[PDB]
Design a protein around this ligand. Structure first.
Ligand SMILES: Cc1cc2nc3c(=O)[nH]c(=O)nc-3n(C[C@H](O)[C@H](O)[C@H](O)COP(=O)(O)OP(=O)(O)OC[C@H]3O[C@@H](n4cnc5c(N)ncnc54)[C@H](O)[C@@H]3O)c2cc1C
Ligand SMILES: Cc1cc2nc3c(=O)[nH]c(=O)nc-3n(C[C@H](O)[C@H](O)[C@H](O)COP(=O)(O)OP(=O)(O)OC[C@H]3O[C@@H](n4cnc5c(N)ncnc54)[C@H](O)[C@@H]3O)c2cc1C
Lengths: 272, 271
């Protein structure tokens, strides 16, 4: 038939280049015969604050409210707030997920952060047995499309802000890969504010071009979960035999698993 | 008598995060600090940047840019009063404590929004005055964080990976960027599986530390003096400094690893 794509957009202005990148993605994907659903979080007045209101049933312990435990119960017995569930169904359906957002304070905008917090509930998006490469969304692929006010030099190894790979790690590993997503090379659009109109149109066409073969791309390297002892006991530590194999190597595995050594160049930006 | 701001991001008064706020205020008050609070949930604080944050005339309402418009609102003084009230607390405060649970490898959305709406240009940063030269270089800041997962999980060989990488974007990107001296974070691991007597220990430990918090050594960030601070050179590290560092085995910090090893616990323990 065709596969299905979810575009999540975090920008308030329809005049923005971020909006322009969303439209370009939908157009390009539709023309290749994808089905495209959107979550324009500002347009939806999406609520980013986790609270008791997210559960519309009886709480297990209302005297001691714990969002993790209560939210999982609500998922299982199916009395989550419908706004959460509607988003959960878009995700269940979608094969590719594009996150389009400007970099704000070295991370995702608050509204998108809240989306993750409310939508990526336990049992739906992760367990504990099933983390990282064994997680629920291992059939799916995800990609960050980001814009910055600062130039790329600033985010280079010798830039004032420091390595962009470090900045992407918490999002791409901690949120996306944790839940199982294969994470594709991020689409990084630097210093957009100082870019003339002809050059922006180029970037849009560049984005559209990439999306024609997005599914066939090689994803980023994360350390496989099979390198670790996955139980409470060993403390989710890297297996002793694997530590012995890596001891002699000059490079670490990833940005997080640098193991006190050098970080593989552009670990979070380019695929091997 | 100095002032302290405690920023708290947790909805429940029954939480350990609230308990840790209360212990901080008590301990600080007893040593004669003035303590102002921002309990963001209790305030029903709004985390979403919008046009509504400017209560005057927009420069260009047809083409709205929050950075430019918010700076003009600051200077001419027609920001939303909720934003301004928080900005005053910051102006006054010498120490800022951020008390929050780790959610998805970062700050909760409500605290993220606070940073987005309150840390406006000219107030909190320019890009003439970044990092060590920034507006809040007289002030000190400290993260107090709690996790569900155990510390092993966030160790060099842990499944989640190095905690230093996780803190970097927050402690460097937000706090130090604006000028704050950042103190050793207070990391409280796997709090839900800690027995009652041990939690009392942690509280007493927190209170003890706060008695001499001002005298502490802050974390090492690369000084701005190592870089050429203008558009032309591209805010790159100076050629002479690159030559100095070429022979060294370790990088400067987590973000300035320079393709080399990261100094151990750069974002967790002070030099
Ligand atoms: C709270 C906050 C925190 C921030 N933190 C950071 C940070 O940590 N690091 C950092 O680097 N930056 C930061 N920024 C800056 C931010 O990254 C930029 O403002 C943002 O990336 C700009 O993207 P945009 O889509 O809004 O651009 P816009 O300015 O909306 O768009 C660029 C230009 O393209 C034009 N345009 C729109 N549509 C089209 C089209 N179809 N064809 C051609 N031209 C078009 C627009 O009119 C405009 O002139 C921050 C900003 C805020 C508000
Ligand atoms: C959306 C989301 C994302 C998350 N992401 C992550 C993540 O990426 N990594 C991670 O590690 N964790 C994560 N967590 C888990 C979260 O970090 C923990 O639940 C939180 O840090 C625990 O703090 P709390 O105050 O809520 O604990 P609580 O359970 O409220 O408190 C802990 C215990 O202390 C007791 N207590 C309360 N007050 C006192 C007192 N005065 N004296 C003694 N005992 C007291 C309580 O009764 C309870 O038994 C996430 C949670 C959510 C909801």
């Amino acid at each position: 038939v065709g596969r299905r794509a979810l575009i999540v957009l975090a920008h308030s202005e329809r005049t923005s280049f971020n909006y322009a990148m969303k439209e370009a993605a939908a157009a390009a994907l539709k023309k290749k015969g994808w089905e495209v659903v959107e979550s324009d979080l500002y347009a939806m007045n999406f609520n980013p604050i986790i609270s008791r209101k997210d559960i519309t049933g009886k709480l297990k312990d209302p005297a001691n409210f714990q969002y993790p435990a209560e939210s999982v119960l609500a998922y299982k017995e199916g009395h989550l707030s419908p706004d959460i569930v509607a988003e959960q169904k878009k995700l269940e359906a979608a094969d590719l997920v594009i996150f389009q957002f400007p970099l704000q304070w070295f991370g995702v905008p608050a509204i998108l952060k809240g989306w993750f917090e409310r939508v990526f509930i336990g049992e739906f998006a992760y367990t504990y047995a099933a983390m990282y490469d064994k997680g629920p969304f291992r059939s799916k692929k995800a990609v960050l499309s980001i814009t910055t006010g600062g130039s790329g030099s600033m985010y280079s190894l010798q830039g004032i802000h420091g390595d962009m790979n470090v900045i992407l790690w918490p999002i791409q590993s901690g949120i996306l890969h944790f839940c199982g997503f294969q994470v594709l090379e991020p689409q990084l659009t630097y210093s957009i504010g100082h870019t003339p109109a002809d050059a922006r149109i180029q970037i849009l066409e560049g984005w559209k071009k990439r999306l024609e073969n997005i599914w066939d791309e090689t994803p980023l390297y994360f350390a496989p979960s099979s390198l670790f002892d996955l139980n409470f006991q060993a403390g989710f530590l890297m297996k002793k035999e694997v530590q012995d194999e890596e001891k002699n190597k000059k490079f670490g595995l990833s940005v997080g698993h640098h193991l006190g050594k050098s970080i593989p160049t552009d670990n979070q930006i380019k695929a091997r």
